[PDB]
């Protein structure tokens, strides 16, 4: 089976007797089993890019091939796991080695063996039954939330020769046996998939439903669809946690995957410390969010190939959960750190530089990753839908979007929540700059809003216009002062102030703003814009009259409605029923209508 | 256990090529194996195997290859990579870049033989930085407080006093004192006079019992400059993660390390990456710097300050740029303050201790610290803006409040940033100086501070 | 219509053959079947990226921004498969599309394409941010064959003159806008203020058009005159006195 080391130079290990080896095959080098990829073949010889430090590898050392390219073990026991970028299990490395270090050349099986999982076979199946890739042949109760749908691997097919009865089985127990063309395949709960290959689908559907974040600016003005591709300018001064924690606690995705792309050592431990302590309410129980996520963490001194692979590992996990019919959300907290790892591989391969020193294929390696998002009809027969949403942060130096990883990312992602240090310094959380930010999914979500929130598309359009008018009017205020504006424009600044101060801002540490349902979000904006339209009608109806309405008259005779329009943020879906909340909003609409009717 | 088998020794030098010596007929060489060359006159030269292929071992020799030949030269192969002879008795001592001593003391009686290359600290085991290290300098400790386990460079430029700053940190650094703290000081690429400065300054001023000092001279072998950080961090990992010490690892010029890594890369005939440095420098630099942090179930924690001479004064250069990507923050030495004779010339405005919010406050230092530091930063920023305004409009056009930010600015540079090379200030003394400056303003002008903190600390 | 789709995750070397397959179909339909063919090639930037990736893998001599030194010839091997041919009623029209990287007109993808193609149609953020669909910026735009596919039997007589005067007025409008940004509108003459007002009225009526609104060339020229009528007749320095006498007052 194995070859022998012929030469070593830095991480490059040339091996011989490798006549059976394949391009990008995964190889273990040396007596310590150091990981590496074959980057060239030259006869019976192979050149291996060893990931880990090769110091101590010798000529004549064994070179053991795995029968596979770089691949992710998929199966039960992912939830709660922590992985490096190449799927090695950092929690289990810790518990087995009892060391603060990863030992060079770990061989710990990625999904923990020996855990007998509770398995229920898919009760419709029988010996002699037909089956195709993506058929759910049984369910594993790995945690309370995520019933793990075991499925036939996408390339496997045939007739079921055996299925295991209900019972407890570990990942190496043969749960299914099937036959095709007279050839038997024995099959386990563990499933191996090539990480740089897209898990296939019945069809990638158009994305049409909101990925609700529970955050007013993010859900109202810049919506991301389930299946959406999005970016965040993740940098310290902007408060990036406001999105990622809110998504993690509240958002309407059944599973989450985190990729530490290549983050600073201490910033990595913040993620790994924090998430275990976060919790969600499910069916009125409180449970740790680690019940529904896996953290593919990588510090900056993890192997280059692990950082470059880490993004592809996280999406390959996310695609397995998508194929279980779950909606995954995938956070990628610095695509720039991944692009540096990619640049280092290209540099070590002695390839020619392109834009700003990045490789030629940076555009393709980004685009072919973001195209792994979307809603799908899964493979296999229970017709189930699912999705992956990719929330891939960017880190343009000095905020300069001309940086090729940032520019190519903004050339691909349909949504960009442009967090800004100027807003974060003012504590305007969630700190999203609404002038910078955008979403392309507005058109595709019209179906959803038409069915469920039919007035909201008008309100969203009016809100964006009022905010744009605030920035335009602010130039006139800076030139000639607020006193010089028309009455319409003065009330436009007052409503834009309410929108900026009490709609778009949301302090997630407060019990009332921990989350914000879409109905609460619509009701708030409906009242602010109802006030805007009634104030604007009162002003415009009294245009060229003797007695004329103005912001000061409105504030004098109905400053209570201005106070209520701010106060509506404090309403609490936990303490207040939906009917109570909706009724208070309806009462404020009636109150403001009577109040304006008393003037004009 | 150990290498029980004897070393082979080869006269079979097939050639020499700059700093390389090309052995042939070699039995099963290891990549990065240490070798001991002997010249025809009997002089030893140390080297490391830089490449292996079949029977061929490419030795990078540390010293020059002068005197090497194809017949009388002999090369002993040690069968193993370079292991640091680590021990706690490396504190109170001075070593050259290879780890041989230069303080007239004996060779290190190793408590262990640790591979210089280290290993990745398992991310599950890493703990968030959550208490302060005092550095003694007020422009750090009061403004950019370093959390124990933070990585944070001092950026500098050619000719600025960053070595005197690093020396002062080495002397003054320690815990908060509301016994088990050590500096490790990797002095890479240091000219002879500056090496004598560090050695003398730490020996003289009582510090040695709590520092391990590594000196690599500007004319020492370029590969020993590469070994020196890896050697220092391997010692710091021994002191922190096995002997439970808190450790502050100071690296004195990462630019001289980048200018060494460039040579080892050129030695393997690797094509240069961006600006002539090896493309993989991000990983090598990370593999240095990330040997830092607190860890699960241990008290020990490596904090680090990589000093870094920005080439051409420029932050866009890959050396500072990569350091700013790996490290949590930065501190700037400034030519303007230096020319003004303000020592230490640390500029507070572009500086940022990324972790400071977990080094400071109640229990860790004093409850006011963040409020003080924010307000001092704001008053120095507004003071610089008002000083520029005075130069445009004249003093008669300034308000009373402008004259307060300007009097604050003058007193701030003379009392807060200025310190002199041997005045040691606690965090507590720095905050009390902070209040003596903030007291210049009316209570209401201190807008970033909470009214509770003003009621407890605005009185003097 | 025939569609060739190479998706952003499909193997990047197929992008090299994708437009070549499309052209080879267009050549069959035009040059053998006498169809009047239009070829659309979408993101020639993704084609040029495939050339850059292949060039890196081959180790070709690099030109600008790491594209191969032959990028002009390869782009010509795509683009020059266009035009009418003697004895055939057929024709291949092409309207390629490309995303200019970082908006840079001097980037090798637009620049070599600009050398090979018969003028170019430009789309701009300075129109799109103001919601001016379709966001076509006339000023950098030209069509080399407009110097023939106009005038009697093809279009109204005035067309060439109207086009040139609209170009002059829009260009001067941009220049006085650049003056206003330094010295303010109080330094502009009444004539200069009319070119700034022209630039506003022009974008609001000539460029602005609905996504399904279809306008004839003759309708477009009547809009052109209704905009040119903003200036006094004597200022229309690109239009001859005969064309003014036949069309200016109408």
């Amino acid at each position: 089976t194995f070859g022998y080391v012929h030469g070593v130079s830095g991480p490059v290990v040339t091996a011989c007797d490798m006549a059976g080896a394949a391009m990008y095959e995964l190889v273990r080098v040396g007596h310590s089993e150091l990981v590496g990829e074959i980057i060239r073949l030259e006869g019976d010889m192979a050149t291996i890019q060893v990931y880990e430090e090769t110091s101590g590898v010798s000529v004549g050392d064994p070179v053991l091939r795995t029968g596979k390219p770089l691949s992710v073990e998929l199966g039960p026991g992912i939830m709660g796991a922590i992985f490096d970028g190449i799927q090695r299990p950092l929690s289990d490395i810790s518990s087995q080695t009892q060391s603060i270090y990863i030992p060079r050349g770990v061989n710990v099986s990625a999904l923990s063996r020996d855990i007998k999982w509770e398995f229920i076979p898919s009760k419709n199946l029988r010996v002699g039954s037909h089956i195709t890739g993506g058929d759910i042949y049984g369910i594993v109760n790995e945690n309370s939330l995520i019933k793990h749908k075991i499925m036939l691997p996408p390339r496997s097919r045939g007739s079921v020769t055996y299925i295991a009865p209900p019972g407890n089985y570990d990942a190496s127990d043969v749960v299914l046996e099937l036959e095709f063309e007279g050839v038997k395949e024995k099959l386990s709960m563990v499933q191996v998939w090539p990480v740089r290959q897209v898990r296939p689908v019945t069809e990638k559907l158009p994305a049409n439903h909101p990925l609700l974040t529970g955050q007013r600016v993010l859900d109202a003005l810049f919506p991301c669809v389930q299946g959406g591709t999005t970016a965040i300018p993740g940098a310290f001064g902007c408060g990036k946690t406001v999105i990622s924690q809110s998504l993690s606690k509240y958002s309407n995705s059944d599973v989450i995957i985190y990729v530490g792309c290549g983050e600073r050592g201490n910033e990595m431990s913040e993620v790994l410390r924090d998430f275990p302590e976060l919790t969600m309410e499910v069916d009125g129980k409180v449970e740790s969010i680690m019940k529904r996520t896996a953290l593919v963490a990588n510090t900056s001194n993890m192997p280059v190939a692990a950082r470059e692979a880490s993004i592809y590992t996280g999406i390959t996990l996310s695609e397995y959960f998508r194929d279980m019919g779950y909606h995954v959300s995938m956070m990628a907290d610095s695509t720039s750190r991944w692009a540096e790892a990619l640049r280092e591989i290209s540099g070590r391969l002695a390839e020619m530089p392109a834009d700003s020193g990045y490789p030629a294929y940076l555009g393709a390696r980004l685009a072919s990753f973001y195209e792994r998002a979307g809603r799908v009809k899964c493979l296999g027969n229970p017709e189930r839908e699912g999705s992956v949403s990719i929330v891939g942060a960017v880190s343009p130096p000095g905020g300069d979007f001309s940086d090729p990883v940032t520019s190519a990312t903004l050339g691909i992602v349909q949504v960009f929540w442009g967090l800004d240090k100027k807003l974060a310094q003012r504590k305007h959380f969630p700190s999203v700059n609404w002038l910078i930010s955008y979403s392309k999914y507005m058109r595709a979500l019209d179906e959803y809003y038409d069915k469920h929130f039919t007035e909201f598309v008008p309100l969203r359009t009016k809100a964006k216009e009022i905010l744009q008018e605030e920035e335009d009017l602010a130039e006139i205020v800076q030139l000639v002062g607020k006193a010089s504006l028309a009455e319409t424009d003065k009330i436009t600044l007052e409503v834009a102030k309410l929108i900026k101060d009490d709609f778009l801002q949301q302090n997630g540490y407060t019990p009332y703003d921990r989350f914000c349902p879409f109905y609460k979000t619509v009701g708030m904006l409906s009242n602010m814009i109802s006030f805007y339209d009634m104030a604007r009608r009162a002003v415009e109806t009294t245009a060229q009259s003797d007695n004329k309405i103005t912001w000061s008259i409105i504030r004098e005779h109905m400053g209570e409605i201005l106070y209520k329009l701010s106060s509506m943020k404090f309403k609490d879906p936990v303490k207040d029923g939906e009917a109570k909340i909706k009724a208070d909003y309806a009462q404020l609409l009636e109150d403001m209508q009577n109040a304006f009717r008393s003037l004009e | 256990n150990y290498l029980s088998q004897p070393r082979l020794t080869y006269k079979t030098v097939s050639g020499v090529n700059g700093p390389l010596v090309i052995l042939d007929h070699v039995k099963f060489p290891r990549y990065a194996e240490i070798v001991h060359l002997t010249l025809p006159d009997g002089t030893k030269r140390s080297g490391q195997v830089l490449e292996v292929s079949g029977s061929k071992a490419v030795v990078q020799v540390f010293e020059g290859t002068s005197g090497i030949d194809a017949k009388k030269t002999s090369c002993e192969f040690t069968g193993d990579i370079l292991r640091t002879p680590v021990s706690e008795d490396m504190l109170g001592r001075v070593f050259n870049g290879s780890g041989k001593p230069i303080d007239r003391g004996p060779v290190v009686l190793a408590e262990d033989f640790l591979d210089i290359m280290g290993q990745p600290i398992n991310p599950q085991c890493r703990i968030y930085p959550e208490e302060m290290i005092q550095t003694g300098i007020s422009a750090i400790d009061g403004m950019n407080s370093i959390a124990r386990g933070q990585k944070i460079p001092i950026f500098s430029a050619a000719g600025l006093p960053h070595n005197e700053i690093a020396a002062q940190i080495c002397r003054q650094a320690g815990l908060v004192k509301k016994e088990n703290f050590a500096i490790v000081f990797a002095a890479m690429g240091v000219n002879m006079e500056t090496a004598r400065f560090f050695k003398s300054d730490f020996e003289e001023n009582g510090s040695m019992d709590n520092v391990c000092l590594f000196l690599n001279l500007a004319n020492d072998p370029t590969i020993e400059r590469i070994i020196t950080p890896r050697l220092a961090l391997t010692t710091a990992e021994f002191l922190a993660y096995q002997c439970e010490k808190h450790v502050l690892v100071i690296l004195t010029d990462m630019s001289s390390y980048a200018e060494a890594l460039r040579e080892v890369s050129a030695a393997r005939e690797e094509v240069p990456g961006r600006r002539g440095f090896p493309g993989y420098m991000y990983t090598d630099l990370a593999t240095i710097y990330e040997r830092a942090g607190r860890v699960e179930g241990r008290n020990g924690s490596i904090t680090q300050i990589p000093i870094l001479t920005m080439p051409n004064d420029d932050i866009t250069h890959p050396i500072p740029d990569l350091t700013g990507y790996i490290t949590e923050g930065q501190i700037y030495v400034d030519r303007q303050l230096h020319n003004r004779q303000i020592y230490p010339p640390i500029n507070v405005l572009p500086s940022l201790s990324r972790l400071m919010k977990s080094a400071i406050g109640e229990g860790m230092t004093r409850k006011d610290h963040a409020d003080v530091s924010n307000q001092l930063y704001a008053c120095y920023a507004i003071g610089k803006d008002v000083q520029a305004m005075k130069a445009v409009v004249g003093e008669e056009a300034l308000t009373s409040d402008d004259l307060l930010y300007l009097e604050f600015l003058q007193k701030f540079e003379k009392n807060f940033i200025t310190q002199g090379p041997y005045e040691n200030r606690t965090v507590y003394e720095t905050l009390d100086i902070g209040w003596q400056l903030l007291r210049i303003f009316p209570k209401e002008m201190l807008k970033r501070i909470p009214q509770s903190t003003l009621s407890e600390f605005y009185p003097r | 219509v025939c569609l060739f789709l190479n998706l952003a995750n499909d193997p990047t070397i197929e992008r090299i053959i994708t437009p070549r397959l499309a052209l080879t179909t267009a050549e069959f339909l035009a040059y053998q079947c006498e169809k009047h063919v239009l070829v659309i090639l979408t993101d020639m930037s993704s084609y040029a990226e495939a050339l850059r990736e292949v060039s890196a893998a081959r180790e070709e001599v690099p030109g600008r921004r790491g594209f191969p030194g032959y990028m002009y010839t390869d782009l010509a091997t795509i683009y020059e498969r266009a035009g009418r041919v003697e004895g055939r009623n057929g024709s291949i029209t092409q309207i390629p599309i490309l995303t200019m990287p970082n908006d840079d007109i001097t980037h090798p993808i637009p620049d070599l394409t600009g050398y090979i193609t018969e003028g170019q149609i430009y789309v701009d953020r300075q129109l799109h941010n103001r919601q001016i669909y379709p966001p076509i910026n006339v000023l950098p735009s030209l069509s080399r064959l407009m110097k023939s596919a106009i005038g009697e039997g093809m279009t109204r007589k005035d067309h060439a003159d109207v086009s040139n005067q609209l170009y002059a007025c829009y260009a001067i409008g941009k220049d006085v806008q650049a003056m206003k940004a330094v010295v303010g509108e109080e330094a502009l003459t009444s004539d200069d203020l009319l070119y700034l007002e022209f630039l506003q009225k022009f974008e609001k009526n000539f460029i602005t058009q609905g996504p399904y609104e279809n306008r004839t060339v003759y309708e477009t020229l009547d809009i052109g005159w209704q905009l040119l009528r903003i200036f006094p007749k004597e200022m229309l320095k690109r239009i001859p006195q005969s064309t003014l006498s036949e069309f200016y007052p109408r």
Binding site: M352, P353 | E269, V271, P272 | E59, V61
Partner: peptide
């Protein structure tokens, strides 16, 4: 970069040829 890379490839060819010339 491209010139230095092409030089490095020619050197590797010359080394390989020089070893083949020993046969």
């Amino acid at each position: 970069f491209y010139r230095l890379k092409k030089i490095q490839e020619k050197k590797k060819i010359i080394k390989e040829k020089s070893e083949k010339d020993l046969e």
